[PDB]
Amino acid sequence: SHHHH
Amino acid sequence: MKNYTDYFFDEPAFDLHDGGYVPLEVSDAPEKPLNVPPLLKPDKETATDVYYTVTAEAGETQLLPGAKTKTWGYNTSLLGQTIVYRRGQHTHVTLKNTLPELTTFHWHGANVSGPYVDGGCHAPVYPGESKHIDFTLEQPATTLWLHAHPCPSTAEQVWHGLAAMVIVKDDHEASLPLPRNYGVDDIPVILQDRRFHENNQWDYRADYDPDGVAGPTAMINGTINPYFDVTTQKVRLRFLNGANRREWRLHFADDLPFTQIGGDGSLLPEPVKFTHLMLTCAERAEVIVDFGQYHEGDEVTLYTDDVPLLKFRIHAFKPDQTTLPDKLFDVKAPVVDPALPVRHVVMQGMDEGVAIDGKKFAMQRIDATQPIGKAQYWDVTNSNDAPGMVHPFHVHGTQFLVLSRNGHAPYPNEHGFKDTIGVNPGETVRLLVRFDLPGVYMYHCHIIEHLDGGMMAQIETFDPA
Amino acid sequence: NYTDYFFDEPAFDLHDGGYVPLEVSDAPEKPLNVPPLLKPDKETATDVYYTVTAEAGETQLLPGAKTKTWGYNTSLLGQTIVYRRGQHTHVTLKNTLPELTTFHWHGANVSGPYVDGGCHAPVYPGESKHIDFTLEQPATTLWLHAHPCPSTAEQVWHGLAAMVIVKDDHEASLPLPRNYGVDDIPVILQDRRFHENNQWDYRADYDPDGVAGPTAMINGTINPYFDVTTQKVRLRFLNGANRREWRLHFADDLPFTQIGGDGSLLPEPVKFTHLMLTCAERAEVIVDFGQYHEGDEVTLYTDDVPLLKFRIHAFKPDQTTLPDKLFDVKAPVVDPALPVRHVVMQGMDEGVAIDGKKFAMQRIDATQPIGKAQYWDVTNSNDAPGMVHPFHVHGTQFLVLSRNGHAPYPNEHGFKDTIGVNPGETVRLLVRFDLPGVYMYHCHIIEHLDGGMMAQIETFDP
Ligand SMILES: [Ag+]
Ligand SMILES: [Ag+]
Ligand SMILES: [Ag+]
Ligand SMILES: [Cu+2]
Ligand SMILES: [Cu+2]
Ligand SMILES: [Cu+2]
Ligand SMILES: [Cu+2]
Ligand SMILES: [Cu+2]
Ligand SMILES: [Cu+2]
Ligand SMILES: [Cu+2]
């Protein structure tokens, strides 16, 4: 799981 | 690499920092197959000549459940049928306008004559009227596009749906190992956003903002909540930022790699590997995605930032052992004319203050001249800072090369021919610019609201004899 | 069996296929809005200095939400601008709209194409421009409106129009009502269609043959009444509609006297019971309420639709009477070296054109030497059923010589800048340009203007 910004 | 952005552009200048930024929101609309604009069938075609009719028209399109949205399009109700051109092929196009407003037919990135064939501000076509144009492209294979370009309002007409992808084929690109089965393993991905109001209608005037118009709903090839059925291992996506102002920060949910093979004006010299790609207005990027690690039934989603855009449903496919060459295309860089000086172009201002070289566009005034056949250094500066935006600088009737960014190397994907380049706040980029044909050509910011707000000038090219 | 108007009844808008009848709104009656006089920045006898700002705002027209409108130094329409013959006039044009516009002084003898403020004189949002001119023309009513090419129609619809009064010595010596807002009022005649939340939507109502809505709007007012406190009232009628014709008469068929048209006082006063105005025509009339008493109400109509209620109050008797001669019209001699110019307006809908072609920003269609009067034969070629087309020419005030080889209408012996040409009809005009420049000529059904029923002429010094 990785989020962007 | 945790304190760093994954994109090449300056992170403080990103649109999401803008005072009036409009975040994208996922729509509740149903999932449906990505609309793939069909190829426009020529009226007639030989090996030497091709004949087309392009008709701008008003209609309705089911986009959201309920009432149909009023839209404009080319040979269809929204966007347009994809138009194939060939290098060296004599092309004959009949332009027809069945809109209730006058319009223009601009072939963005097409090295054609101006100001008429180029179809910018000086090529109006009234309701009911037809025009004829003729040209032969002497340019590499690449992805271009067509859109309305009255001065003004280009913004309004693009919002009412007037854009279509134009594919340019050549012999060199045909010989490379690339997905090329249009609709199956090679697809347009026209990236736009809209705001739907009551009755699922658009209203450019209500949403107007002088620093760029942006809606919360993404729309890909005129589709809300699209999915695409993958039936091959490798897929080619022809990305086009057809938005008024929004930037797209593209990446798969799981950081699946993809290889960029082409930009605005040509194949890249070498393939460039990406997990994250940012595109400013009017930029094109052609990428190969390899889905070889996924199983049948899997669904891989393409994101902008944290918002899902396009879902890839993975079916069974034959293995693909093909592999891209180290080199895709030979970039023959012209020598600079020593006689010519450095041209300085300064994009300046925000909102209503937007200008170039201290002045707003005027239809009648020629701002600059340059000889044909002779290459010149253009230093192009985005003047605004602090609160700043990345300004996509575009020049009609040419394909330039990017030499430097603030004295430093251009971005990894900028070593080919481009017609639009994102200039960061405070930045000077150096282009190498040569015009082949005589005529009047504009250059401008491609945030379309800036274009309409006068952030535009025109250059006259002449034969020195 | 006979129409009371001068024009050809078959060609009246009300026979058009897509005719929209006016309907009286249910909105409450309210005082007629009288746009205030624009206060100058500075004024001497020799110079006047004005700031004109195109701005976007909101106006209460119907109950509920405010309508989103444009205006000049106000939210809708504009403050009345007073110019004086022979006074050096300095105007700052300022655009605080969200799109580019133009400042056209319809009927002003000024230079073009910049001061004139036509297609070629854009002003971008946030920008300013400076113009300087001196009017050398007789007293009359003109107006200001937007004129981008296109869309003039859209911007006029948004509300960009304002009355311009040109004063002079001769008119000042005449016995006319002249107390602006008490016995001398603008009557700007428009129509609109109100959509949800009382908003306008030009694109929704668009029609290439002319845009009309069912709700009359007088000086940016719905269902107006005006309090009369004098025996004599001067009305300055302006047809500021996109397409619609006004067929004006009072209850009781109360007479009224026309004293002026587009470009000048009429040579002689002309008594009417019924008067028809096409787009951009102006007519100044004197109404006499001598027969009426306190509390009497006198309705101004178009066709059978009430527009404006005059409420009579007690007034001082006014026993002035208009001279037999208001104004001396000195007709120039036609230069015999010059040919007869033939201008043909043709087509309907998206086929509208002039002399077989649509307007092009780049193309000069005509030339004429300044200081030299020339016959223009202007033909409306539209087969019956057709429209009355109001032909307009920038930067001049012409004289009307004939209609189909016959006398012009009784109110057409003065100077005019707009003339209603009937289907099939050829009118001969006498046209002289004083100043050099580039000037448009076109139909003033505004949608036809935008649809390219427009050409341009260059005037030069010999
Ligand atoms: Ag990522
Ligand atoms: Ag900004
Ligand atoms: Ag008609
Ligand atoms: Cu473009
Ligand atoms: Cu372009
Ligand atoms: Cu352009
Ligand atoms: Cu006018
Ligand atoms: Cu005019
Ligand atoms: Cu005009
Ligand atoms: Cu007309």
Q: What does DSSP say about strands B456-462 and B368-371: parallel, antiparallel, or unpaired?
A: parallel
CATH number of the domain that residue C387 is part of: 2.60.40.420
| Residue from C35, C79, C34 nearest C53 by CA | C79
The alpha carbon of residue B115 and the mean position of all alpha carbons in its chain are separated, in whole angstroms, by 20
Q: Which one of the ligands is nearest to B450 CA?
A: 2
Of the residues B153, B174, B195, the one at which a domain ends? B174
Overall domain count for chain C: 3
Distance B463 CA to ligand 6 centre (A): 23
Q: Which chain B residues have a beta carbon less than 8 Å from that of C208? A: 100, 127
- Say if residue B42 is preceded by a cis peptide, omega within 30 of 0: no
CA atoms within 13 A on the CB side of B20: 12
Does residue C13 lie within any of the structural domains?
A: no
Q: Where are the alpha helices (DSSP H) in C80-123?
A: none
Cβ contact B63:B200 at 8 Å: yes
Q: What is the 3-state secondary structure (H, E, C) of B329-391?
A: CCCCCCCECCCCCCEEEEEECCHHHCEECCECCCCCCCCEEEECCCEEEEEEEECCCCCCCCE
Give the count of Cβ contacts less than 8 A between chain B and C: 47
The alpha carbon of residue C338 and the mean position of all alpha carbons in its chain are separated, in whole angstroms, by 30
Question: How many other CB atoms are found less than 10 A from the CB of residue C312?
Answer: 18
Range of the domain at C449: 341-460
Q: Interface of chain A against chain B, CB under 8 Å? A: 2-5
d(CA C420, CA C407): 14
d(CA B158, CA B148): 6
The alpha carbon of residue B409 and the mean position of all alpha carbons in its chain are separated, in whole angstroms, by 23
Alpha-carbon distance values, C187 to C181, C221, C234 (Å) = 11, 10, 10
Q: Hey, what amino acid is at B454?
A: G
Element (H, E) at C398: strand C398-403
Distance B45 CA to ligand 1 centre (A): 45
Q: Which chain B residues have a beta carbon less than 8 Å from that of C196? A: 198
Q: Which chain B residues have a beta carbon less than 8 Å from that of A3? A: 306
Does residue C8 lie within any of the structural domains?
A: no
The alpha carbon of residue B465 and the mean position of all alpha carbons in its chain are separated, in whole angstroms, by 35
Chain C residue with Cα closest to B123: C360
Cβ-defined contacts of B178-185 (< 8 Å, 24+):
B178/B236, B178/B261, B178/B288, B179/B232, B179/B234, B179/B235, B179/B236, B179/B288, B180/B236, B181/B232, B182/B36, B182/B39, B182/B82, B183/B36, B183/B38, B184/B231, B184/B232, B185/B231, B185/B232, B185/B234, B185/B235, B185/B236
Do both C292 and C391 map to the same domain?
no
Checking phi first, is residue B186 left (phi over 0); if not, alpha (psi -120 to 50) or beta?
Answer: beta
| Residue from C86, C79, C75 nearest C50 by CA | C79
B256 vs chain C: nearest CA distance in angstroms?
Answer: 43
Cβ of A5 within 8 Å of Cβ of B303? The answer is no
C–B contact: 3+ Cβ pairs < 8 A: yes
Do both B363 and B290 map to the same domain?
no
Does residue C128 lie within any of the structural domains?
A: yes
Phi/psi at B401 (5° precision)? -120, 145
| Residue from C28, C98, C94 nearest C57 by CA | C98
Does residue C30 lie within any of the structural domains?
A: yes
Do both C231 and C158 map to the same domain?
no
CA atoms within 13 A on the CB side of C136: 6
Instruction: State both tokens at B322.
Output: 């093909």
Do both C160 and C58 map to the same domain?
yes
Angle at the Cα of B76 (from B75 to B77), degrees rounded to 5? Answer: 140
Do both C153 and C62 map to the same domain?
yes
d(CA B436, CA B438): 7
Distance B305 CA to ligand 9 centre (A): 50
Does residue C437 lie within any of the structural domains?
A: yes
- CB-neighbour burial class of residue C170 (10 A; exposed 0-12, middle 13-18, buried 19+): middle
Which residues place a Cβ less than 5 A from the ion ligand 8? C 106, 394
Cβ-defined contacts of B112-118 (< 8 Å, 24+):
B112/B137, B112/B397, B112/B437, B113/B397, B113/B437, B113/B438, B113/B439, B114/B396, B114/B397, B114/B437, B114/B439, B114/B440, B114/B441, B115/B439, B115/B440, B115/B441, B116/B439, B118/B396, B118/B397, B118/B439, B118/B441
Cβ contact B432:B400 at 8 Å: yes
DSSP letter for C422, please.
Answer: P
- CB-neighbour burial class of residue B198 (10 A; exposed 0-12, middle 13-18, buried 19+): exposed
Q: Hey, what amino acid is at C314?
A: A
Contacts of C458 by beta carbon, 8 Å cutoff, 6+ apart: C364, C366, C367, C368, C437, C438
Distance B88 CA to ligand 6 centre (A): 24
Do both B97 and B141 map to the same domain?
yes
Angle at the Cα of C225 (from C220 to C229), degrees rounded to 5? Answer: 120
Q: Which one of the ligands is nearest to B283 CA?
A: 4
Contacts of C338 by beta carbon, 8 Å cutoff, 6+ apart: C368, C369, C372, C374, C375
Does residue B352 lie within any of the structural domains?
A: yes
Checking phi first, is residue C75 left (phi over 0); if not, alpha (psi -120 to 50) or beta?
Answer: alpha
Question: How many other CB atoms are found less than 10 A from the CB of residue B145?
Answer: 26
B267 vs chain C: nearest CA distance in angstroms?
Answer: 39
Question: Which of B256, B276, B306, B309 has the most A C-beta neighbours within 10 Å, making it the best mutation to test the interface with A?
Answer: B306
Secondary structure of residue C7 in the 3-state scheme: coil
Do both C27 and C113 map to the same domain?
yes
Q: Which chain B residues have a beta carbon less than 8 Å from that of A4? A: 249, 251, 303, 305-306
Cβ contact B201:B101 at 8 Å: no
Instruction: State both tokens at B310.
Output: 């396009």
Beta bridge partners of residue B223, listed in sequence order = B220
Instruction: State both tokens at C221.
Output: 């007012």
B–A contact: 3+ Cβ pairs < 8 A: yes
Of the residues B293, B314, B335, the one at which a domain ends? B314
d(CA B6, CA B3): 10
A5 vs chain B: nearest CA distance in angstroms?
Answer: 7
d(CA B24, CA B191): 12
Do both C28 and C159 map to the same domain?
yes
Do both C149 and C183 map to the same domain?
no
Checking phi first, is residue B75 left (phi over 0); if not, alpha (psi -120 to 50) or beta?
Answer: left
Dmax (CA) of chain C: 63
d(CA B302, CA B248): 11
Does residue C14 lie within any of the structural domains?
A: no
Torsion C167-C169-C171-C177 (CA) sign: positive
Q: How was this structure determined?
A: X-ray
Give the count of Cβ contacts less than 8 A between chain A and B: 13
Cβ of C361 within 8 Å of Cβ of B363? The answer is yes
Beta bridge partners of residue B300, listed in sequence order = B312
- Say if residue B65 is preceded by a cis peptide, omega within 30 of 0: no
Task: Please give the radius of gyration of chain C, using alpha carbons only, rounded to the nearest integer.
Answer: 21
d(CA B60, CA C271): 54
Cβ contact C292:C286 at 8 Å: no
d(CA C302, CA C308): 10
Do both C355 and C398 map to the same domain?
yes
Instruction: State both tokens at B2.
Output: 């945790």
**Residue located via tokens 């040419």:** B398
Cβ contact B216:B365 at 8 Å: no
Contacts of B130 by beta carbon, 8 Å cutoff, 6+ apart: B94, B95, B96, B97
Resolution in A: 2.5
Of the residues B109, B140, B174, the one at which a domain ends? B174
- Say if residue B152 is preceded by a cis peptide, omega within 30 of 0: yes
d(CA B101, CA C208): 9
Q: What does DSSP say about strands B267-274 and B258-262: parallel, antiparallel, or unpaired?
A: antiparallel
Instruction: State both tokens at C248.
Output: 């004006």
Do both B385 and B308 map to the same domain?
no
Q: What is the DSSP string of B113-182?
A: -TTTTTTSTT--B-TT-EEEEEEE--S-SEEEEEE---TTTHHHHHHTT-EEEEEEE-HHHHTS-----B
d(CA B307, CA B249): 10
Instruction: State both tokens at B409.
Output: 């190397």
Question: How many other CB atoms are found less than 10 A from the CB of residue B46?
Answer: 10
- Say if residue B153 is preceded by a cis peptide, omega within 30 of 0: yes
Beta bridge partners of residue B368, listed in sequence order = B459
Do both C27 and C157 map to the same domain?
yes
d(CA B21, CA B42): 42
| Residue from C138, C185, C148, C147 nearest C163 by CA | C185
Distance B422 CA to ligand 4 centre (A): 14
Phi/psi at C427 (5° precision)? -110, 135
Does residue B328 lie within any of the structural domains?
A: no
d(CA B155, CA B234): 35
CA atoms within 13 A on the CB side of B55: 13
| Residue from C128, C130, C103 nearest C118 by CA | C103
